[PDB]
Amino acid sequence: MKGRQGQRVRLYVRGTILGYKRSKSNQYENTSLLQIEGVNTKEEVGWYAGKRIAYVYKAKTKSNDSTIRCIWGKVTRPHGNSGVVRAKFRSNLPPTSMGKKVRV
Amino acid sequence: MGAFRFHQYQVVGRGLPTPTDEHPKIYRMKLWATNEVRAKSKFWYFLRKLKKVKKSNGQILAINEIFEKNPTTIKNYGIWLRYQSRTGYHNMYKEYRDTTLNGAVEQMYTEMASRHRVRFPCIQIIKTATVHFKLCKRDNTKQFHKSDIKFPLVYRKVRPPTRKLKT
Amino acid sequence: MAPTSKMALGIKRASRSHTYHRRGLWAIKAKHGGALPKAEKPAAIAEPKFYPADDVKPRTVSTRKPHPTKLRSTITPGTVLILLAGRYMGKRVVFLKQLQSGLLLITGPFKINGVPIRRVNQAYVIATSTKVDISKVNVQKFDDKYFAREKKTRAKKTEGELFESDKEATKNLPDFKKDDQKVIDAELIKAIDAVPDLKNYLGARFSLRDGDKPHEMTF
Amino acid sequence: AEQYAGEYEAQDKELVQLKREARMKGGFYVSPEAKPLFVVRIRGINAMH
Amino acid sequence: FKEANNFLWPFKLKAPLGGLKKKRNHYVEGGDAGNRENYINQLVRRMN
Amino acid sequence: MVSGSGVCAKRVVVDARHHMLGRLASIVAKELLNGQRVVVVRCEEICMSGGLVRQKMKYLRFLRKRMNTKPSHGPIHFRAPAKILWRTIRGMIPHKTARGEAALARLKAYEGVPPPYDRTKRMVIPDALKVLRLQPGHRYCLLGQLSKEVGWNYADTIRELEEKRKEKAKVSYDRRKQLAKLRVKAEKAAEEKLGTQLEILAPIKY
Amino acid sequence: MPFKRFVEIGRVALVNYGKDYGRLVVIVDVVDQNRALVDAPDMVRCQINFKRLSLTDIKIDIKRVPKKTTLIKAMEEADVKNKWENSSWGKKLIVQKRRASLNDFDRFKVMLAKIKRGGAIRQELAKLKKTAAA
RNA sequence: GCGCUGAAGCGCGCGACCCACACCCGGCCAUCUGGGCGCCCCGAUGAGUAGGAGGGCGCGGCGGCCAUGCAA
RNA sequence: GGAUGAACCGGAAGCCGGGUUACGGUGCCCAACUGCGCGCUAACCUAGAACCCACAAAGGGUGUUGGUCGAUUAAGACAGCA
RNA sequence: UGUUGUCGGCCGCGCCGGCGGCCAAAGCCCGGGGGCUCCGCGCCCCCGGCAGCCGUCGUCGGCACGGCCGGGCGCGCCGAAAGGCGUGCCCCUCGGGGCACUGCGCCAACGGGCUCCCCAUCCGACCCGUCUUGAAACACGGACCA
């Protein structure tokens, strides 16, 4: 049909953001450090390089900023390789938007 | 079978009623459904349709299903049928090729929907009738399958089968 | 539910035993609860405060419960850690910190002339045979007294103890270098030999202290 | 609940087979059920009388 | 015990976990509304 | 399942040959929004499903609309297949916002090949056409069959398509004749290949 | 594609998904032009409407009509077809599976070492090219 | 809107997902349940124009108390 | 939520935080399926509960699918040619 | 003052397993009869022993993770650790189990605010006030301020 070869692709999947570092004086850009709870398999991190993490910016749920901004980054590289990974965000995030569950 | 299609529910019952020498007398009318949730409802359509009762002047004794009846295996079901389209309900006598009682409903719901146009509110059918393979009368898919059982023709359309990849 | 049923099924049961040993001695622990304790000069005030004792004792125990257990999920010893690969023998490092798993700080001394220390996502670490009770936390970077040499001679003894296992075990020596190369890490195979510790651990315990307080650091 | 059904197997023998394979449903006897209820209010108070 | 209920006085239920099948529909059509022994015990174990 | 065209940190070249125009545009708009810099190549060879007359009326209602009503300045209509694809992208992206306009400006559509992007173009995960006009399933229309009935840029584009195809066929034919020679001496030196203790556990993992 | 659909035996088919979580199958009974019964020797039989389950090239030597014992016998006669199956056409998954199993120590040293040698082979191969070239 | 066509239409079934300030949960503000020592605590309901009812902020001069001012 | 939208749907709101959901939706714009089994349509029909807002009738249609009933058939049909 | 490990509570998650419900049963092997098709294959149905395992209700059993918020336990000995070491009863009478028996007290590691702008996102329909069933309003009133 689809000719399943395929690959797999599944949404799962939650993770948490450890903390986002926005630094300058003027040489560095920005870092975000990410922890998926268990997930991607050593094979499925490795085969890949290239996770998109899309997190909805959903009311969470006092009155939140409910906006039509869903943000999706890309995972650069493991640093943590059997767990934790480095990530970057391209728009830049919401407020202190550290914490909130990360998903694909 | 996996995520239903319509297991027929054998409801034996009553009609439990009054201090007069009367009482209602016995029925099944054997109805195809998904478990009790359809039954309860199924009875009020049977009770409105045939006898007129109430809701309360139907009482239900027990329910028995049917458990893989057919063993996977086969018949091309004759169905006597009602479809609601551009007015009320019109009769149809459909005899179609299928697997089973699970499949017959869907092939009817899809053919009453496409073929007959039917949209939601609709209730089901009147009956479903096994028949023998040589007997199956009218028309296209089933006639070919009847011929396949004959055989020669299990072994015809392998003749596309084995003719996608190549020999 | 399977761990948590076991706790119930007195209630207390050992804690009904505990009283007894005091009851057995003879006749007691109402008098000693009421009559005690200290007090009376002091200076000032409300004396709202505090600690040592009784709560602290469940908080240390409680904190001990992930600690085996996270090793049962991930398998290994604990800290102190050796370069398998690199130099055939050579020297020893302790996991003081996680930036993450993978990004790790591996440690030592420096008080006069010194010694580096690395933060790595890897380069060279597989664990040994010792356990402590931390996971992988201490740091900034401190140590020092004899200890470029001691930590290091502690290394030599582990490097001998390891080098023999690396001969018996490996697939060979060249990807024990790929295993050492990795350093997240982790699950597959852990426990080979290197018997016993008693010194190795005493050494590791000092190393933890040294990467703590109070030396060289105070003004 | 097993005994309430259970007399209905123990005396009966007309209930299962004929019944899979045929229509109508049986004479004889029936066993009663009870039963209390719970209610949860699914739909809000906007636009109802 | 019809007056032991006389509870204290309403259960305050959580919204159901994973939702309904749609609210505007009864038990017959695979909806939620109306009487149903089986599915109430499903629904209250979602409304935790 | 895994989308096998999609992310690369930097690439981005897309083959449009007998791909479905709105399906290809949908992924391209998503890659552009992600911050990719997207080059669609072979825009003349891209396909749209549906019967020619009904595709021809849609564009034609724009062509009578090209004329009037008049300041000048736009509403505007592009005759030619890259620019039809660009018109499709400038509806796919939210086309009133700086994040969308900045995504639009990261797209290029090129007809035939530009002068050489000889790193291969890649197919989009089943974007491609054959079936999506289904056997039969009535007509399809190529963008280079639409734009012959709407004008140049097309006409030059299909004449440059022709030359770029003819020369790269010739250059392919001989590079293949040397590649086959290299393959045959490579396979014999894997048939031979010296020995193992470690080494043949890897080809027991093909 | 509308494709292969049918009504015959001998033709192995391979999965485009379901529950199970497997799976490869061959069609035993044939039961119009949509519905068919697919089974396997060490796999569970199912009757599906299965447009979107596609049949592979390699074909196994049986005739029409199979109950269970007969099917088993046919499988025994064939086998070989499963190997083609481990490899290749549909089929593939045992060579792939050999892939997935590998992010693991012992497994990682077997790999550097395939690599290390692979290099020696590149170097020999390269020397050969240089003699051939001029 | 781009705009699809063995669907990104339509219908019959179905699986998983998304999504509010709702509902839950955590912490906190009024009133009321009341409770307990001028003060503390338990739980519930709790948008708002016209508008009633009640507590409070600020202006200016007066009196008694109580200060501030060579930097008001 | 319905493109916008006083009164349609969900929903009745102190503020905040997190979780799960309702209505409704899951190709892109836009989070989230280019979801599964099946069937019909090729007109760009067509992406639509409701709306001054979304038109489409009487009547017609060997387009196509599907269901059924009668009669005629290898005691050779229907059509064509002879 | 900032961060990170954690113990306790709350909620989410996926996966595995058992038993009973449909007197259980698909089942297969063995054995007997019937039918259709009467061109024979093949199809069907029923009954007893029997590997077997099924889709669904209900229920119980086992694990592993995340998010958010906060900081009941001891009172002799050994044991790093977790853990056991008082004794009586009873079921099983195997491993073991439950059951009974004073008062008192009360954590680890390491070294900023705000203004204007720009980009993202929404309000957005001005505001504002008024008139009005309905105001952005192509309804009315204001140049701007003290």
TrEMBL record, chain C:
<dbReference type="Pfam" id="PF01159">
    <property type="entry name" value="Ribosomal_L6e"/>
</dbReference>
<dbReference type="GO" id="GO:1990904">
    <property type="term" value="C:ribonucleoprotein complex"/>
</dbReference>
<dbReference type="InterPro" id="IPR000915">
    <property type="entry name" value="60S_ribosomal_eL6"/>
</dbReference>
<protein>
    <recommendedName>
        <fullName>60S ribosomal protein L6</fullName>
    </recommendedName>
</protein>
<dbReference type="InterPro" id="IPR014722">
    <property type="entry name" value="Rib_uL2_dom2"/>
</dbReference>
<dbReference type="GO" id="GO:0006412">
    <property type="term" value="P:translation"/>
</dbReference>
<keyword id="KW-0687">Ribonucleoprotein</keyword>
<comment type="similarity">
    <text>Belongs to the eukaryotic ribosomal protein eL6 family.</text>
</comment>
<dbReference type="InterPro" id="IPR049633">
    <property type="entry name" value="Ribosomal_eL6_CS"/>
</dbReference>
<dbReference type="GO" id="GO:0003735">
    <property type="term" value="F:structural constituent of ribosome"/>
</dbReference>
<keyword id="KW-0689">Ribosomal protein</keyword>
<dbReference type="InterPro" id="IPR041997">
    <property type="entry name" value="Ribosomal_eL6_KOW"/>
</dbReference>
<dbReference type="InterPro" id="IPR008991">
    <property type="entry name" value="Translation_prot_SH3-like_sf"/>
</dbReference>
<dbReference type="GO" id="GO:0005840">
    <property type="term" value="C:ribosome"/>
</dbReference>
Automatic annotation (TrEMBL), chain E:
<protein>
    <submittedName>
        <fullName>Ribosomal protein L7</fullName>
    </submittedName>
</protein>
<comment type="similarity">
    <text>Belongs to the universal ribosomal protein uL30 family.</text>
</comment>
Automatic annotation (TrEMBL), chain F:
<protein>
    <submittedName>
        <fullName>Ribosomal protein L13a</fullName>
    </submittedName>
</protein>
<dbReference type="InterPro" id="IPR036899">
    <property type="entry name" value="Ribosomal_uL13_sf"/>
</dbReference>
<dbReference type="GO" id="GO:0005840">
    <property type="term" value="C:ribosome"/>
</dbReference>
<dbReference type="InterPro" id="IPR023563">
    <property type="entry name" value="Ribosomal_uL13_CS"/>
</dbReference>
<dbReference type="GO" id="GO:0003735">
    <property type="term" value="F:structural constituent of ribosome"/>
</dbReference>
<dbReference type="Pfam" id="PF00572">
    <property type="entry name" value="Ribosomal_L13"/>
</dbReference>
<comment type="similarity">
    <text>Belongs to the universal ribosomal protein uL13 family.</text>
</comment>
<dbReference type="GO" id="GO:0022625">
    <property type="term" value="C:cytosolic large ribosomal subunit"/>
</dbReference>
<dbReference type="GO" id="GO:0017148">
    <property type="term" value="P:negative regulation of translation"/>
</dbReference>
<dbReference type="InterPro" id="IPR005755">
    <property type="entry name" value="Ribosomal_uL13_euk/arc"/>
</dbReference>
<keyword id="KW-0687">Ribonucleoprotein</keyword>
<dbReference type="InterPro" id="IPR005822">
    <property type="entry name" value="Ribosomal_uL13"/>
</dbReference>
<dbReference type="GO" id="GO:0003729">
    <property type="term" value="F:mRNA binding"/>
</dbReference>
<keyword id="KW-0689">Ribosomal protein</keyword>
<dbReference type="GO" id="GO:0006412">
    <property type="term" value="P:translation"/>
</dbReference>
